[PDB]
Design a protein around this ligand. Structure first.
Ligand SMILES: [Mg+2]
Ligand SMILES: [Mg+2]
Ligand SMILES: [Mg+2]
Ligand SMILES: [Mg+2]
Ligand SMILES: [Mg+2]
Ligand SMILES: [Mg+2]
Ligand SMILES: [Mg+2]
Ligand SMILES: [Mg+2]
Ligand SMILES: [Mg+2]
Ligand SMILES: [Mg+2]
Ligand SMILES: [Mg+2]
Ligand SMILES: [Mg+2]
Ligand SMILES: [Mg+2]
Ligand SMILES: [Mg+2]
Ligand SMILES: [Mg+2]
Ligand SMILES: [Mg+2]
Ligand SMILES: [Mg+2]
Ligand SMILES: [Mg+2]
Ligand SMILES: [Mg+2]
Ligand SMILES: [Mg+2]
Ligand SMILES: [Mg+2]
Ligand SMILES: [Mg+2]
Ligand SMILES: [Mg+2]
Lengths: 190, 176, 204, 134, 107
RNA sequence: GGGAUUAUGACUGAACGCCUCUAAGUCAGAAUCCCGCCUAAAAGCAACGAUAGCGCCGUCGGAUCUCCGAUAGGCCCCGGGUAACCGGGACCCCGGCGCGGAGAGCCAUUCGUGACAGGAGCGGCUAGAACGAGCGCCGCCCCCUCUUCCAGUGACGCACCGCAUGUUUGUGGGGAACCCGGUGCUUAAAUGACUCGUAGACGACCUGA
RNA sequence: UGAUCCUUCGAUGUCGGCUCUUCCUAUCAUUGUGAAGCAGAAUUCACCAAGCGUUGGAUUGUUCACCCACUAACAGGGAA
RNA sequence: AGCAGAACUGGUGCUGCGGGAUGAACCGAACGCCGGGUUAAGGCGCCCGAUGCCGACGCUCAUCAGACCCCAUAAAAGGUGUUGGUUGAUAUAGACAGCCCGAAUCAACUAGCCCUGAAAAUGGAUGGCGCUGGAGCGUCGGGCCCAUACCCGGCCGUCGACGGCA
RNA sequence: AGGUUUUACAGCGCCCUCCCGCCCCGACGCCGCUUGCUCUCCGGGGCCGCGG
């Protein structure tokens, strides 16, 4: 069936400025500027209110496939609001049995060189995405913190490192070596 | 049955042929929806011959006339009880429609039974048609139009008249 | 248009391959000269991977004994559209071969047509004939990934063409603002002539 | 982003069909395709018209859903829809398109002579304001 | 100019049978079956040029020739009309210009 | 040597308060695929050289014979978006939006020749290369404009006696011939034989005179 | 392999090998993977996948077998 | 078995024509030579006559989609793809899900389309192009297209005349 | 579910009456079937009038 109306509002904090140009959400916060173009979901994005106006997402005459994107777009804007205020901290730890995984960060956190993975002589150079800065965390042995505004860039940067330390031609249940995401948090805790 | 166009409602009444053994046999009234009265009389001898022991030659048709809509200008909720024979078996089915006339709602049922279940007109047997109140509607697609102060735009107007100007420098607007 | 034009110049951007080819092939049979520009802007319904597989399946149709005689798999979006129109013409006859001669296809808008008005066929547009939830494949990207080697230069000369056309449109708007300003200054000098146009619905 | 909605009382313009060119009031919504329209002051009896033939205007009357023609007419005259319509530019484009379609050969001659001289006066000062700007 | 533009789109035919005694014309701005009522009965003309000169009624002899005809009826729902000429139109004229005169006038 | 990706492993994230590689949207990804490199070079084409009494602008060449097409006012130009867009003004505001700042329109365009009143061809400059302008912007000569529209007064242009191929682009495009006043260059090339042997059945090919 | 007898009896040269080209994938090997009763090594199951390779010999006219070695593997077939 | 052998009837052999792309046999319809009209079966994005209807409602996305007698293959079994339907059970004495929160949820079954199941050899076949608000599927409306069929007329011959003239 | 509890600051049914309360439109661009011989110098298009 076709649902007449499916709406979902998104509250916007006062320290955030969300502007709309059609289906292009430009979120402005104290940490930076995020801009996602939603020209593919075909929704109605209204900015209701005058004092820190909210964001209302409408879908008229949408089937089950189209109503599923109403909360998807709302959840994406909430990540853009959460990214420009609290940030995203995808910290991951290096797990190894015998050969310590030596990870050195270069290019101001934009390049990650992984060495001594399973005793291999090949150096794995994982390059981060724009807006993501990597660093060897302090007060922890083999922790690797990733900070940024866009969750999809901080998360994909962590997946690039996790898939770079993949064991081939071995029992991955036995050889648990690698750098796996341990916590998906924020830069600023609230 | 073909279900050509609208399916007008006919009140077809009939009875067995009277005899000296059974004078004045019982009269049976049916609620037949057919495109014309010829099909309505033929549909009568199909549903009655399988309920009573009377064929077209064993009995006669006493009256066959149109049943007009008593409120053609009022939006009504129609609950239709029907049975149809699919490719595997026969299934009892209740469907709700929303039309101005009873014959229009039954016509929607034949177009919908063929669209969603690939049922042909000869495989459908409309058992009961009833004007249902808005409180007793079971389908959510009907209950969404049971909202006072209903409001919705017409988003993304598909361009018709695509060949009146077949060639033009103007790309069509879809927002109105 | 719809006026039996001498040369009908159609823009290819936003149009569907077979939807436009069906109408173009009918025009060239009626004796009309059709020029379809920006054939890389044509889009085909269905996701990109589907339409690419259809062309990859067409690439494999070579003649076994001698591929130099086999199907000539043209990679440019112009010749791809040209063959789609050829498939809708009796090109093995004299009236069908003369129909292909009335059709000229171009990747982008060459100088002979960058200073012309491009038409649009609303019965073949993607925004009209496709639901907004359906996937479509751009013929420019499809051609580039099957062997077209002139996509970057076509995109470079097109942005050079748009920046040049944008400069004129700015001058054309200035000339229009002075035109509307002129109508207000001679309003009392043309009031007798406006009433003739107002009386017969020429001006609202 | 939408400003014109299908609501109870929305004055709609019949784009095509039997009563093409006349205004009706959406009294009730039957389905996602049809509506119960009723033009009491425009000459359109109450009936079911599809949504593809209706063009929503900017006018809404205060009428309950599925109300009688007696009360739809009162809301149509209170809001002065017929007056507000004829003053709108879209209604004036319809009148101008009818006057132009009814032009005779003598009317097309008088118009040809008017635009031929009217444009020359506009084009002459357009060249004057263009030279003054340089 | 006192004639509307038409196109000789082909002969009246099915799919595998062609009837050359009737021609199908394509009027310029006529794309409905209801708009062809004006042109029903108007004289058609296929004006062409040959090598040898021929007599011209009301003028000097030139190499211009013509095959006269008339719009007989409507064909389809897209403004196409059927036309019968004094001689069957040559197939080389398929897609060329046909003159639809304003006479016999009924307005 | 690259590209898009397959299998696959993932990201964000709903549907389904959780979850989820998928639904929308993203990432990595291969002896595959396509391309590059490489080989061929089209009834495909470009630049450039040289062009034997032969050819040009003549200015609108004048007046003649032959073919071959059509056509019968227009070579009207933002980019584009579509759950939006357009115009104007110092991101905001105003205005328009079944889209008259409209390709359903717009711009043209509605018989002449001569006596009357109203109505508003040379030099500079900059620019165009995707298959280049039937270019533009200035200031000086050429006459006096049926420039265009509305009104007139007294005349003639066969008014060819009801009749078709009229009317446009058109000063069209190809030939070869024929008369008048000014300019280009006439130490052009290919090929045969001979020669060469980096070549080769024969032609062809590489050469040299 | 049969069953059938439709085409061919004023003829379509008949087994195998040699030779040579291309094709199919129901993948032996190689590339990228998933699964295990995957610790490693080896092996098995499965997926994308026919790009590339798939041998030298003894015996037999042999296709088919069998054995000797070699090898990443010595996969199976079609094209009268 | 496109095998072999029968029964009824039709067809075909002996037969062209419209349609099924193609074709012996299917569908329509059987044929003197023609003009006009209208149909059948089948069709009307383009090839290719005709929907260039502002056709109705719904279903459907396929990284082997689908696309109509004969007919040019596909099954058992599956899908938390998606849309209907059937029959139960928990629920504002607070369910389901997540770790209190506050309103529908859960289960079985079934039926459409789609998907998996689904591997062959020269390169290739809804006929081709292509089509995805459709040119697909189902239910239908209006208009339209033409057969050597039907209707009207002209002509030829044959047949018949309960026919006409010495 | 309009107005603040069922008509109130909108409306929507269903009964009992009031001559069917009474008047008015009769399938009318809201929905059917037809002449009881439908009427029209009532229009338009195409085709051809052969013989005698
Ligand atoms: Mg191992
Ligand atoms: Mg890559
Ligand atoms: Mg994937
Ligand atoms: Mg990638
Ligand atoms: Mg505004
Ligand atoms: Mg004078
Ligand atoms: Mg036999
Ligand atoms: Mg022989
Ligand atoms: Mg033989
Ligand atoms: Mg032989
Ligand atoms: Mg395989
Ligand atoms: Mg297994
Ligand atoms: Mg037999
Ligand atoms: Mg016989
Ligand atoms: Mg037969
Ligand atoms: Mg077939
Ligand atoms: Mg006939
Ligand atoms: Mg066909
Ligand atoms: Mg099944
Ligand atoms: Mg299974
Ligand atoms: Mg299912
Ligand atoms: Mg399948
Ligand atoms: Mg007869």
């Amino acid at each position: 069936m076709k649902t007449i109306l499916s709406n979902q509002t998104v509250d916007i904090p006062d320290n955030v400025t969300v502007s709309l140009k059609g289906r292009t959400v430009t979120v402005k916060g104290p940490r930076g500027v995020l801009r996602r173009e939603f020209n593919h979901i075909n929704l109605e994005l209204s900015l209701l209110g005058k004092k820190q106006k909210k964001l209302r997402v409408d879908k008229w005459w949408g089937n089950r496939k189209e109503l599923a994107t109403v909360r998807t777009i709302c959840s994406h804007v909430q990540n853009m609001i959460k990214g420009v205020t609290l940030g995203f901290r995808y910290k991951m730890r290096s797990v190894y049995a015998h050969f310590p995984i030596n990870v050195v960060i270069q290019e101001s956190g934009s390049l990650v060189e992984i060495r001594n993975f399973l005793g291999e002589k090949y150096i794995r150079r994982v390059r981060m995405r724009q807006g993501v800065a990597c660093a060897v965390s302090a007060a922890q042995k083999d922790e690797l913190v990733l900070e940024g505004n866009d969750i999809e860039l901080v998360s994909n940067s962590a997946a690039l490192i996790q898939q770079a330390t993949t064991v081939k031609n071995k029992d991955i249940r036995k050889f648990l070596d690698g750098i796996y995401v341990s916590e998906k948090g924020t830069v600023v805790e609230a | 049955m073909k279900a050509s166009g609208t399916l007008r409602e006919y009140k077809v009444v009939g009875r067995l042929l009277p005899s000296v053994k059974n004078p004045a046999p019982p009269l049976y009234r049916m609620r037949i929806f057919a495109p014309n009265h010829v099909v309505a009389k033929s549909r009568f001898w199909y549903f009655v011959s399988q309920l009573r022991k009377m064929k077209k030659a064993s009995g006669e048709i006493v009256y066959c006339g149109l049943v007009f809509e008593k409120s053609p200008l009022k939006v009504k909720n129609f609950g239709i009880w029907l049975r149809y024979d699919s490719r595997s078996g026969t299934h009892n089915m209740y469907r709700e429609y929303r039309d101005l006339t009873t014959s229009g709602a039954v016509t929607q049922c034949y177009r919908d039974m063929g669209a969603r279940h690939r049922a042909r007109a000869h495989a459908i047997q409309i058992m009961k048609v009833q004007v249902i109140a808005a409180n007793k509607c079971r389908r959510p697609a009907i209950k969404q139009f049971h909202d006072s102060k209903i409001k919705f735009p017409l988003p993304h107007r598909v361009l018709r008249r695509q060949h009146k100007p077949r060639f033009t420098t103007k790309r069509p607007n879809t927002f109105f | 248009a719809d006026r039996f034009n001498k040369v009908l110049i159609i823009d290819g951007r936003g149009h569907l391959l077979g939807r436009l080819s069906a109408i173009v092939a009918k025009q060239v049979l009626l004796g009309h000269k059709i020029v379809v520009v920006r054939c890389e802007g044509i889009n085909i319904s269905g996701n990109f991977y589907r339409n690419k597989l259809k062309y990859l399946a067409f690439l494999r149709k070579r003649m076994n004994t001698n591929p130099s005689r086999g199907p000539y798999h043209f990679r440019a979006p112009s010749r791809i559209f040209w063959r789609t129109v050829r498939g809708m013409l009796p090109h093995k006859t004299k009236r069908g071969q003369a129909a292909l001669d009335r059709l000229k296809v171009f990747d982008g808008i060459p100088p002979p047509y960058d200073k012309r008005k491009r038409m649009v066929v609303p019965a073949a547009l993607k925004i009209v004939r496709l639901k907004p939830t359906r996937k479509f494949a751009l013929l420019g990207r499809l051609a580039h990934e099957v062997g077209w080697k002139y996509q970057a230069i076509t995109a470079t000369l097109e942005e050079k063409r748009k920046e040049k056309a944008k400069l004129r449109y700015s001058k054309k708007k200035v000339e229009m603002k002075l035109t509307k300003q002129a109508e207000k200054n001679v309003e009392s000098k043309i009031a007798v002539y406006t009433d003739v146009l107002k009386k017969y619905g020429v001006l609202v | 982003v939408f400003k014109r909605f299908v609501e109870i009382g929305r004055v709609a313009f019949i784009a095509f069909g039997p009563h093409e060119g006349k205004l009706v009031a959406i009294v009730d919504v039957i389905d996602q395709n049809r509506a119960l329209v009723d033009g009491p002051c425009t000459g359109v009896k109450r009936q079911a018209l599809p949504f593809k033939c209706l063009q929503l205007t900017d006018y809404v009357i205060k009428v309950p859903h599925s109300a009688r023609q007696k009360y739809v007419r009162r809301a149509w005259e209170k809001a002065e829809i017929s007056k507000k319509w004829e003053e709108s530019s879209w209604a004036k484009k319809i009148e101008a398109r009818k006057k132009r379609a009814a032009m005779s050969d003598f009317d097309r001659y008088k118009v040809s002579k008017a635009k031929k001289m009217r444009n020359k006066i506009i084009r002459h000062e357009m060249k004057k304001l263009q030279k003054a700007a340089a | 100019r006192l004639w509307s533009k038409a196109i000789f789109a082909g002969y009246k035919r099915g799919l595998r049978n062609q009837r050359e005694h009737t021609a199908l014309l394509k009027l310029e701005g006529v794309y409905n079956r209801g708009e062809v009522d004006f042109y029903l009965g108007k004289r058609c003309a296929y004006v062409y040029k040959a090598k040898k000169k021929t007599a011209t009624p009301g003028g000097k002899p030139n190499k211009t020739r013509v095959i006269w005809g008339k719009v007989t009826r409507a064909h389809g729902n897209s403004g196409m009309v059927r036309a019968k000429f004094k001689s069957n139109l040559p197939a080389k004229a398929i897609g060329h210009r046909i003159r639809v005169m304003l006479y016999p006038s009924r307005v």
